[PDB]
Design a protein around this motif. Structure first.
Motif, PDB file in Angstrom:
ATOM      1  N   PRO A 125       1.008  -1.326  -0.145  1.00  0.00           N
ATOM      2  CA  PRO A 125      -0.560   0.111   0.068  1.00  0.00           C
ATOM      3  C   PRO A 125       1.074   0.989   0.049  1.00  0.00           C
ATOM      4  CG  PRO A 125      -0.492  -1.611   1.791  1.00  0.00           C
ATOM      5  CD  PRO A 125       0.215  -1.690   1.142  1.00  0.00           C
ATOM      6  N   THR A 126       0.501   1.785   0.261  1.00  0.00           N
ATOM      7  CA  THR A 126       1.401   3.966  -0.289  1.00  0.00           C
ATOM      8  C   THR A 126       1.249   4.179   0.854  1.00  0.00           C
ATOM      9  OG1 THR A 126      -1.543   4.754  -0.970  1.00  0.00           O
ATOM     10  CG2 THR A 126       0.912   3.842  -2.844  1.00  0.00           C
ATOM     11  N   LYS A 127       0.222   4.248   1.819  1.00  0.00           N
ATOM     12  CA  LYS A 127       0.203   4.611   2.966  1.00  0.00           C
ATOM     13  C   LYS A 127      -0.327   3.632   4.417  1.00  0.00           C
ATOM     14  CE  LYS A 127      -1.226   8.895   5.685  1.00  0.00           C
ATOM     15  NZ  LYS A 127      -0.277   9.617   6.372  1.00  0.00           N
ATOM     16  N   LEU A 128       0.305   3.912   5.460  1.00  0.00           N
ATOM     17  CA  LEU A 128       0.243   2.786   6.138  1.00  0.00           C
ATOM     18  C   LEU A 128       0.119   4.088   7.753  1.00  0.00           C
ATOM     19  CD1 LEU A 128      -0.639   0.023   7.678  1.00  0.00           C
ATOM     20  CD2 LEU A 128       1.688  -0.359   7.709  1.00  0.00           C
ATOM     21  N   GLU A 129      -1.367   3.779   8.444  1.00  0.00           N
ATOM     22  CA  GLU A 129      -1.235   3.964   9.666  1.00  0.00           C
ATOM     23  C   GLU A 129      -1.707   4.103  10.997  1.00  0.00           C
ATOM     24  OE1 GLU A 129      -2.930   8.180   9.285  1.00  0.00           O
ATOM     25  OE2 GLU A 129      -5.076   7.112   8.096  1.00  0.00           O
ATOM     26  N   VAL A 130      -1.797   3.845  11.696  1.00  0.00           N
ATOM     27  CA  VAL A 130      -2.249   3.691  12.790  1.00  0.00           C
ATOM     28  C   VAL A 130      -3.296   4.552  13.138  1.00  0.00           C
ATOM     29  CG1 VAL A 130      -2.258   2.509  15.452  1.00  0.00           C
ATOM     30  CG2 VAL A 130      -0.586   2.156  14.196  1.00  0.00           C
ATOM     31  N   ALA A 167      -4.443   0.587  -6.123  1.00  0.00           N
ATOM     32  CA  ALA A 167      -5.373   1.079  -7.782  1.00  0.00           C
ATOM     33  C   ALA A 167      -4.867   0.106  -8.363  1.00  0.00           C
ATOM     34  CB  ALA A 167      -4.668   2.652  -8.681  1.00  0.00           C
ATOM     35  N   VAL A 168      -3.959  -1.136  -8.404  1.00  0.00           N
ATOM     36  CA  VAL A 168      -4.351  -1.695  -8.752  1.00  0.00           C
ATOM     37  C   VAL A 168      -4.810  -3.489  -7.721  1.00  0.00           C
ATOM     38  CG1 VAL A 168      -2.357  -1.267  -9.839  1.00  0.00           C
ATOM     39  CG2 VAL A 168      -1.810  -2.732  -8.416  1.00  0.00           C
ATOM     40  N   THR A 169      -5.090  -4.498  -8.823  1.00  0.00           N
ATOM     41  CA  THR A 169      -5.631  -5.364  -8.534  1.00  0.00           C
ATOM     42  C   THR A 169      -4.896  -6.039  -7.093  1.00  0.00           C
ATOM     43  OG1 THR A 169      -5.873  -7.470  -8.828  1.00  0.00           O
ATOM     44  CG2 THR A 169      -4.379  -6.721  -9.921  1.00  0.00           C
ATOM     45  N   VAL A 170      -4.696  -6.843  -5.871  1.00  0.00           N
ATOM     46  CA  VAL A 170      -4.356  -6.971  -5.062  1.00  0.00           C
ATOM     47  C   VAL A 170      -5.450  -8.381  -4.300  1.00  0.00           C
ATOM     48  CG1 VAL A 170      -3.706  -7.172  -2.664  1.00  0.00           C
ATOM     49  CG2 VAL A 170      -3.143  -5.337  -3.823  1.00  0.00           C
ATOM     50  N   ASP A 171      -3.911 -10.103  -4.481  1.00  0.00           N
ATOM     51  CA  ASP A 171      -4.396 -10.983  -3.856  1.00  0.00           C
ATOM     52  C   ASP A 171      -5.154 -10.911  -2.513  1.00  0.00           C
ATOM     53  OD1 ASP A 171      -6.513 -13.245  -3.876  1.00  0.00           O
ATOM     54  OD2 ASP A 171      -4.060 -14.154  -3.768  1.00  0.00           O
ATOM     55  N   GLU A 209      -3.261 -12.947   7.978  1.00  0.00           N
ATOM     56  CA  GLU A 209      -3.638 -12.444   6.547  1.00  0.00           C
ATOM     57  C   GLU A 209      -5.273 -11.962   6.461  1.00  0.00           C
ATOM     58  OE1 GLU A 209      -2.337 -16.008   4.176  1.00  0.00           O
ATOM     59  OE2 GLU A 209      -4.609 -15.633   2.748  1.00  0.00           O
ATOM     60  N   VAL A 210      -4.676 -10.852   5.365  1.00  0.00           N
ATOM     61  CA  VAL A 210      -6.437 -10.529   4.687  1.00  0.00           C
ATOM     62  C   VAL A 210      -6.593  -9.936   3.707  1.00  0.00           C
ATOM     63  CG1 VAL A 210      -6.900  -7.781   5.403  1.00  0.00           C
ATOM     64  CG2 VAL A 210      -5.896  -8.697   7.192  1.00  0.00           C
ATOM     65  N   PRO A 211      -8.315 -10.374   3.283  1.00  0.00           N
ATOM     66  CA  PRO A 211      -8.261 -10.415   2.261  1.00  0.00           C
ATOM     67  C   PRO A 211      -8.367  -9.109   1.196  1.00  0.00           C
ATOM     68  CG  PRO A 211     -10.413 -11.034   3.247  1.00  0.00           C
ATOM     69  CD  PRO A 211      -9.087 -10.479   4.403  1.00  0.00           C
ATOM     70  N   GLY A 212      -7.498  -9.599  -0.169  1.00  0.00           N
ATOM     71  CA  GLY A 212      -7.454  -8.074  -0.916  1.00  0.00           C
ATOM     72  C   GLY A 212      -8.075  -7.340  -0.887  1.00  0.00           C
ATOM     73  N   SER A 213      -9.714  -7.445  -1.097  1.00  0.00           N
ATOM     74  CA  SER A 213     -10.766  -6.076  -0.758  1.00  0.00           C
ATOM     75  C   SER A 213     -10.989  -5.252   0.700  1.00  0.00           C
ATOM     76  CB  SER A 213     -12.018  -7.121  -0.616  1.00  0.00           C
ATOM     77  OG  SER A 213     -12.662  -7.179   0.221  1.00  0.00           O
ATOM     78  N   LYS A 214      -9.897  -6.023   1.604  1.00  0.00           N
ATOM     79  CA  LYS A 214      -9.757  -5.201   3.157  1.00  0.00           C
ATOM     80  C   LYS A 214      -8.788  -4.064   2.276  1.00  0.00           C
ATOM     81  CE  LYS A 214     -14.046  -6.331   3.376  1.00  0.00           C
ATOM     82  NZ  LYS A 214     -14.433  -7.300   4.662  1.00  0.00           N
ATOM     83  N   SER A 215      -8.701  -2.405   3.613  1.00  0.00           N
ATOM     84  CA  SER A 215      -7.835  -2.517   3.569  1.00  0.00           C
ATOM     85  C   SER A 215      -7.713  -2.003   5.285  1.00  0.00           C
ATOM     86  CB  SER A 215      -8.198  -0.761   2.783  1.00  0.00           C
ATOM     87  OG  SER A 215      -8.895   0.059   3.473  1.00  0.00           O
ATOM     88  N   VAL A 271       5.883  -0.874  24.718  1.00  0.00           N
ATOM     89  CA  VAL A 271       6.640  -1.760  23.446  1.00  0.00           C
ATOM     90  C   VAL A 271       6.671  -0.790  22.424  1.00  0.00           C
ATOM     91  CG1 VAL A 271       7.198  -3.782  22.522  1.00  0.00           C
ATOM     92  CG2 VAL A 271       6.932  -3.354  24.776  1.00  0.00           C
ATOM     93  N   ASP A 272       8.386  -0.856  21.658  1.00  0.00           N
ATOM     94  CA  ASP A 272       8.043  -0.944  20.715  1.00  0.00           C
ATOM     95  C   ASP A 272       8.128  -1.333  19.371  1.00  0.00           C
ATOM     96  OD1 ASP A 272       8.390   2.198  20.241  1.00  0.00           O
ATOM     97  OD2 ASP A 272      10.631   2.194  20.873  1.00  0.00           O
ATOM     98  N   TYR A 273       6.835  -1.409  18.319  1.00  0.00           N
ATOM     99  CA  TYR A 273       6.555  -1.869  17.447  1.00  0.00           C
ATOM    100  C   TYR A 273       6.685  -1.707  16.442  1.00  0.00           C
ATOM    101  CZ  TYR A 273       4.772  -6.027  20.879  1.00  0.00           C
ATOM    102  OH  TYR A 273       4.181  -6.743  22.194  1.00  0.00           O
ATOM    103  N   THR A 274       6.793  -2.311  15.289  1.00  0.00           N
ATOM    104  CA  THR A 274       7.369  -2.728  13.789  1.00  0.00           C
ATOM    105  C   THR A 274       6.170  -3.340  13.304  1.00  0.00           C
ATOM    106  OG1 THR A 274       9.451  -2.343  12.224  1.00  0.00           O
ATOM    107  CG2 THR A 274       8.925  -4.180  13.359  1.00  0.00           C
ATOM    108  N   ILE A 275       5.182  -2.343  12.720  1.00  0.00           N
ATOM    109  CA  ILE A 275       4.536  -3.183  11.813  1.00  0.00           C
ATOM    110  C   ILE A 275       4.297  -2.983  10.202  1.00  0.00           C
ATOM    111  CG2 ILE A 275       1.681  -2.945  10.832  1.00  0.00           C
ATOM    112  CD1 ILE A 275       2.718  -1.547  13.668  1.00  0.00           C
ATOM    113  N   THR A 276       4.265  -4.570   9.401  1.00  0.00           N
ATOM    114  CA  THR A 276       5.244  -3.580   7.776  1.00  0.00           C
ATOM    115  C   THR A 276       3.946  -4.936   7.606  1.00  0.00           C
ATOM    116  OG1 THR A 276       6.618  -4.955   6.171  1.00  0.00           O
ATOM    117  CG2 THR A 276       6.760  -6.182   8.951  1.00  0.00           C
ATOM    118  N   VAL A 277       3.598  -4.330   5.796  1.00  0.00           N
ATOM    119  CA  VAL A 277       1.968  -4.849   5.406  1.00  0.00           C
ATOM    120  C   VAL A 277       2.707  -5.517   4.114  1.00  0.00           C
ATOM    121  CG1 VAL A 277       0.568  -4.415   4.648  1.00  0.00           C
ATOM    122  CG2 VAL A 277       0.573  -3.940   6.684  1.00  0.00           C
TER     123      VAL A 277
END
Length: 93
Positions: free
Chosen positions: A4-9, A25-29, A48-54, A65-71
């Motif tokens: 994705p282009t932008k990831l926020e909490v 803007a493009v197809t994602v499984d 894992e999260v379906p491609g239709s959900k954001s 705690v310092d966590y590091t999320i990656t998508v």
């Protein structure tokens, strides 16, 4: 040049984080959401999260705690699973 282009909490809780991102803007499984203590300590975990959900919600975190999320945004085009350039953020729960 990421997807994705932008990831926020958006929402936070002492033991949980709510994260939103931007529909590419493009197809994602599907997406894979990855999270662990930043600094290698305690192995990474994922779900894992379906491609239709954001939107996802991360649970069972330790407070303060310092966590590091990656998508990762995976595609399934002519026969193959391949992910776009992933996106990370750091967040202090």
């Amino acid at each position: 040049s990421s997807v994705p282009t932008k990831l926020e909490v958006v929402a936070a809780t002492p033991t949980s984080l709510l994260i939103s991102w931007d529909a590419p803007a493009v197809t994602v499984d599907h997406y894979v959401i990855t999270y662990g203590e930043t600094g290698g300590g305690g192995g990474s975990q994922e779900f894992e999260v379906p491609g239709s959900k954001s939107t996802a919600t991360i649970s069972g975190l330790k407070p303060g705690v310092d966590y590091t999320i990656t998508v990762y945004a995976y595609e399934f085009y002519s026969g193959e699973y391949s992910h776009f350039s992933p996106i990370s953020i750091n967040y202090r729960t």
